[PDB]
């Protein structure tokens, strides 16, 4: 018996692949229709590979590996969609909402992020021999930006598209049932193991389900679930909530763009994008804040920032358009900045989590990897470094991270965009360095949190900082 | 008796009929969805002095409305007592605050905010109402952006707020307790023959000798299908309003209502306290010629930007619980439709725009008195539902007002632009609005709120209004 | 004279041209069109100039750069067309001032506008 814990894109994708390739075994998938804190239903979603490229990512070994996997994942999507739509009919709707992406460069951000990241995207496309061209901004269809927020350069990426995350989830559920999978709409409370082997899963209704294989894909809750097992509290890297806000808008005239429209990734892994939808709706996203506790609701600030960027940088017509829904989901944000994919020291215990911005995009590849491992294979080459049971990765020097966190902090100003006296940005640059350098030194002699998490720690309570100093120390004692 | 509509007005008249006429069967129509419903989107402020504008208190019709609002205030303490009496502790409190603080900041037009602050101060003095101008440093809770902060503040005693949701629950409960029957369907058609008085949307027919229409923004469209009444009952449009429920960062809230005076096109900024670490913020206002059930991006951003800068920066990091949308019933001549009709047994209670909820106890008592052969409340005769369009202001006053309010949308943003531009816009707005007013009718001028909506509507919708205004002139002159 | 933005750049060429003319030559070919003694040139249609003056007026906003509600630029675009069209029609049946001069005339005194109507009329009588 196989139990998949979690009903997001990752859980359902691995569920579909297990059910399809092992018709002998019973595969049961846990999780409720509410999908509380669920990243997948809040996603547009972009099949982000080249669009996700930053200069900072492609300057670390670990970042170049992640990029390579995203490129590999892209190649699986056409046949993966075909195989999921094959179990349905025309009236179930299309999973694919666009084939192509246009990356826009405007001046509503930091030159140190947006200029560097546009160049890095262009470079990464050239390296991978991906079909693309720099196009005239006047040739980008549909957009009607505020002239003071308009793009002056535009990049057409061919075969980098989007899916309707809701139709994708429905198609995965349908495809899972078609292949003999059983959906049990309850949550796992506890994984039971003895003598270093999985026995099964206690559910929140009090029942016990036995299994020789348990795959944890419970998004941001995945580590908290596995860490209760002996020793594993300091052997599985913590996952926090990368709380993301997006919106569904009914456009003034029912129109939408033919392509994804996006900027490169911005301050603290935020970014602006519009994903086309059917029936006169568009998806706009997406904010990102690492929160030490989960949060199920958008802030005022997140809503205003998302709406202000979309109306000025993409289409002024969105200003008079109707707000259908504000969506909130938790990107699983791993403490060392890299996913938790594969095997555990406990036999039969697998983990598929900590995918942050691009779990959905990588889902077909990550599912195939874990199934290969479960069948005694080696799966996909580059995914070994992202073993779920590991010492915290140090992908960057403390120096690189301190430069990055100050740059991203300054970027929150330029992205607003602020208006202030010209002396003030220079003052803030110099006065931000000291406090972040002091925090990094106080937290650990060995581990440095990535920028996204460091800013969250900087503005957390003293108790939460002290708890992190203890965590980092306990992890050092376990591994060094 | 059939009451058509399940807003504050319908339920308030329903409760008062059921309580004072135990002999008769009173049935109230309307669904739990409350589509386009103003009441559930309301904070709501018991607005009397807070609603005072210089423009309102310069017309005879405006000074009457104000007087009624002052009268309505006196009924609220016993009205709440009598509604809470039919429930228990666990149903929650209707009243959320006793007092209001009016704030004056510079995030708006001097021609509205300075004039309206002075008019509020004056109206409080005239009515001998308890109030004082207080130091801004003594206003509790507020944490504005210094560049958006108030420099003057006005404490109004006994001007407070209710939870509109607990009020609706208490009205429904009190209606059932007094023998009322709730039928959760919508009226499709009022049936009358030989000048005497409902077909429901499920196909059924309900007989009655009394029909009270309190269907908010749908009230006139429902009565206008009857013979002649299309040009005898003033049109009601949708004053679409956006508000929000926010869970505050620390669970705190202010002890008083916090508000500005009314702003461009009857918009305004206010925070109404709620129980359980929530606050209400509102409220936008746009007259729409067709109904709209969803907030625009612009409305949401404007409401949130004003609240975070002018009231409390802590709201910026606070969680958005809900964006609310309701339709203020916006009468074409700017005044309510309350009382009797030329059809026997047909009553109307609508077109209350910003303050139907506040006036509900008084308006309910008025219509019940009229239904029992009484005269009700003195000042409400001018607001007969069957009337020629009122002309409360000269065309000249309205053209000055619409240009001033248009400019105010800029100062309220607040915009930053070259100093020559506001002077250019002032002069280039006058011609087009003067041309529209002249084209629409020789006799009727729409109030500013509706004139801007007509200005930016389609040519077909403008032409239809020219026909309507002409047909109303032929009916009455 | 009348070199506006680029007399300084063109000075060596313009000097050589006038000296050639003074010495009985033809100077530089393309400069005959710009004889000082002439009827007012009409290099653009009234339509082109009215589009240009509204566009340039809006540009003064974006160049500031302003920050204002997104409805406002669309309102100003439509409400600027009428007044500039009215001014152009009132000034002359034949001549249209270029955009740079039209905005100056738009925001001048009524007396100065009337004086320009007389000037344009007197020029028409001299050359038609
Ligand atoms: C605002 C936003 C925008 C995004 N945009 C994109 C995008 O453009 N492109 C892209 O590729 N991806 C996007 N993502 C998603 C990103 O790729 C995520 O990393 C990915 O969705 C993670 O998938 P998951 O299945 O691990 O997590 P989730 O979607 O969180 O799924 C986990 C599920 O398990 C359930 N669960 C929790 N606890 C238990 C339990 N104990 N037992 C059982 N079930 C449990 C949860 O309720 C949830 O439904 C976006 C996410 C957000 C929030
Ligand atoms: C954003 C906002 C803020 C406000 N703030 C305040 C405030 O601070 N103070 C204040 O005093 N008031 C406030 N109001 C409300 C104002 O006073 C309104 O004038 C008042 O609520 C109108 O009440 P009503 O019963 O006439 O209409 P509604 O509250 O709209 O009730 C009418 C009901 O009739 C129903 N209906 C429609 N068609 C039919 C049909 N055919 N059959 C049956 N039922 C039907 C509708 O669904 C609706 O539920 C606010 C309103 C809004 C939108
Ligand atoms: C801010 C600015 C920036 C410019 N930048 C450039 C540029 O980058 N490139 C470029 O090519 N050009 C530039 N120009 C100038 C442009 O090329 C002009 O067309 C050119 O300078 C005109 O030269 P002029 O000799 O006709 O006039 P002027 O330079 O005005 O000289 C005329 C002179 O005659 C004098 N005068 C007036 N009345 C009498 C009289 N009765 N008797 C005697 N003398 C009299 C005046 O006092 C003056 O000194 C710029 C001009 C300005 C104002
Ligand atoms: N407080 C009311 C107000 O400002 N009225 C505006 C006013 O009439 C004109 O603009 C100014 N500034 O004078 C006008 C120019 O189109 O737009 C108005 N506003 C609108 N109309 C839109 C539709 O109802 C649908 N979606 C929205 O978001 C609404 N916003
Ligand atoms: N793109 C992420 C980001 O900007 N992070 C911030 C960042 O760490 C600091 O701000 C800058 N500008 O550097 C910091 C100073 O307090 O506030 C951050 N913003 C937040 N944290 C709030 C909580 O999650 C709950 N409610 C919100 O609305 C969130 N907004």
Author numbering:
A (entry chain C): 12 to 491
B (entry chain D): 13 to 209, 212 to 491
C (entry chain B): 364 to 491
Task: Provide the authors' original text about this structure.
The side chains of E312 and E434 likely experience significant conformational changes upon substrate binding. Mutant E312A confirmed the necessity of changes in recognizing substrates, whereby the binding affinity versus ST-F dropped 10-fold, in addition to losing the reactivity to form 8 (Fig. 2d (ix); Supplementary Table 3). E312 another key residue collaborates with F316 to facilitate the decarboxylative reaction by introducing a repulsive electrostatic force. The fact is that the residue experiences a substrate-induced conformational change bringing the terminal carboxylate group in a short distance (3.3 Å) to the carboxylate group of the oximinoacetate moiety evidenced by mutational experiments whereby compound 6 becomes the major product in the presence of E312A (Fig. 2a (v)). As a result, E312 undergoes a substrate-induced conformational change, in which upon addition the induced decarboxylation should facilitate β-elimination. E312 not only recognizes the streptolidine base but also ushers the β-lysine to crawl into the binding site in a compact manner. In this context, E312A is able to catalyze the formation of 5 and 6 but no more 8, as opposed to F316A, which catalyzes the formation of 8, the dominant product (Fig. 2a (v), d (ix, x)).
